[PDB]
């Protein structure tokens, strides 16, 4: 079904692209000959990614540095990235605020910052991107986690933000089908991935073999390109078997008609 030609000349934004999965996605897209606009806070790190993207064969590569704690930067970043590429086909929302494993006690500012960066900025970027995505019948790719489908200790604020993404984007996907907005939304449910950040955060706590970041990056892009509603990627075969929630899907399909959406 997937062919790398599907990404050739496509106009793609990748957030949190200076390292980890984001950087690997920028690299895969570059190899595929897409036009890429990468973002993160570090201009020096983003420059290195852009240069490697050009070397890999990107149709074009640019960066715009800024913090996703600033909603006005998020809004302006999309307009600028859209002007740089002459449009937008795929919006890959991948960035998160720095998170470490800890028992929750009273760090309200960290809960708020997690909600603002991991969730609110994704909504802001979606609003700013939607008119161009509507023009191109494009795609929104939302990077989530197993911690955004199931409960784990030590990631309360992070988990809340990832569950919020599922709630918001899954509701918006239902709205897009009724309002005939031909923009796909891909929610990516990832297990532990071998990024430097993850390996460091998890040492001495988690035993798990982490999945490779290169293949993870590719599966995200494939799912988005194929307009899949959800992408599941983890190293455990058992979680893979159990993660799907067919009963949630039946329940949503059951009540899809029960609404008189003529008013909207």
Ligand X SMILES: NC(=O)c1ccc[n+]([C@@H]2O[C@H](COP(=O)([O-])OP(=O)(O)OC[C@H]3O[C@@H](n4cnc5c(N)ncnc54)[C@H](OP(=O)(O)O)[C@@H]3O)[C@@H](O)[C@H]2O)c1
Ligand Y SMILES: O=C(N[C@@H]1[C@@H]2C[C@@H]3C[C@H]1C[C@@](O)(C3)C2)c1cnc(N[C@H]2CCOC2)nc1C1CCCC1
Does position 159 bind ligand X by CB under 6 A? no
Among 13, 26, 34, 68, binds ligand X (CB under 6 A): 68
Among 180, 200, 237, 247, binds a second copy (CB under 8 A): 247
Answer for the pair 248, 165: CB distance below 8 angstroms, yes or no.
no
Mark whether 158 is an active-site residue: yes
Distance CA 24, CA 65 (A): 18
Distance CA 56, CA 29 (A): 9
Q: Is 50 annotated as a binding residue?
A: no
Among 192, 211, 218, 231, binds ligand Y (CB under 6 A): 192
- Cα 45 to chain centroid distance, Å, stands at 20
Give, in order, the Cα–Cα distances in Å from 9 to each of 29, 58, 163. 10, 9, 33
Closest to ligand Y by CB, 247 or 258: 258
Among 58, 78, 132, 192, binds ligand X (CB under 6 A): 192
Q: How many CB atoms lie within 10 A of CB 62?
A: 18
Q: Give the one entry of a second copy, ligand Y, ligand X, none that residue 69 binds, where binding means its C-beta sits below a cut-off of 5 to 8 angstroms depending on kind.
A: ligand X
Q: Is 136 annotated as a binding residue?
A: no
Does position 172 bind a second copy by CB under 8 A? yes
Distance CA 159, CA 129 (A): 25
- Cα 62 to chain centroid distance, Å, stands at 19
Write phi, then psi, for 11 (nearest 5 degrees).
Answer: -95, 105
Measure the CA angle with vertex 85, ends 84 and 86; round to 5°. Answer: 100
Does position 197 bind ligand Y by CB under 6 A? yes
Does position 141 bind ligand Y by CB under 6 A? no
Closest to ligand Y by CB, 84 or 193: 193
Helix (H, G, I), strand (E, B) or coil at 34: coil
CB of 201 to a second copy, least distance (A): 11
Distance CA 123, CA 130 (A): 10
CB of 97 to a second copy, least distance (A): 15
> Among the options 63, 122, 158, 233, which is catalytic?
158
Q: Which of residues 21-80 bind ligand Y (CB under 6 A)?
A: none
List residues with catalytic annotation.
158
Q: By CB under 6 A, name the binding residues for ligand Y.
A: 99, 101, 145-147, 152, 154-155, 158, 191-192, 197-198, 201-202, 206, 208, 255, 258
């Amino acid at each position: 079904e997937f062919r790398p030609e599907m990404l050739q000349g496509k106009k793609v934004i990748v957030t949190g692209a200076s390292k980890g999965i984001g950087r690997e996605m920028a690299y895969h897209l570059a190899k595929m000959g897409a036009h890429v606009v990468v973002t993160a806070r570090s201009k020096e790190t983003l420059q290195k990614v852009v240069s490697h993207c050009l070397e890999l064969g990107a149709a074009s590569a640019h960066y715009i540095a800024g913090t996703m704690e600033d909603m006005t930067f998020a809004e302006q970043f999309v307009a600028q990235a859209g002007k740089l590429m002459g449009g937008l086909d795929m919006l890959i929302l991948n960035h998160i605020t720095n998170t470490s494993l800890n028992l929750f006690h009273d760090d309200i500012h960290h809960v708020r910052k997690s909600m603002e960066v991991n969730f609110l900025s994704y909504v802001v970027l979606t609003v700013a991107a939607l008119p161009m995505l509507k023009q191109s019948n494009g795609s929104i790719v939302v990077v989530s986690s197993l911690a955004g489908k199931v409960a784990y200790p030590l990631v309360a604020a992070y988990s809340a933000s990832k569950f919020a993404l599922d709630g918001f984007f899954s509701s918006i996907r239902k709205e897009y089908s009724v309002s005939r907005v031909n923009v796909s939304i891909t929610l990516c449910v990832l297990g532990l991935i071998d990024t430097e950040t993850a390996m460091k955060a998890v040492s001495g706590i988690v035993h798990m073999q982490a999945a490779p970041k290169e293949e993870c990056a590719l599966e995200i892009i494939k799912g988005g390109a194929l307009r899949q509603e959800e992408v599941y990627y983890d190293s455990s075969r058992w979680t893979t078997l159990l993660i799907r929630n067919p009963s949630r899907k039946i329940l949503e399909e059951l009540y899809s008609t029960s609404y008189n959406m003529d008013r909207f």
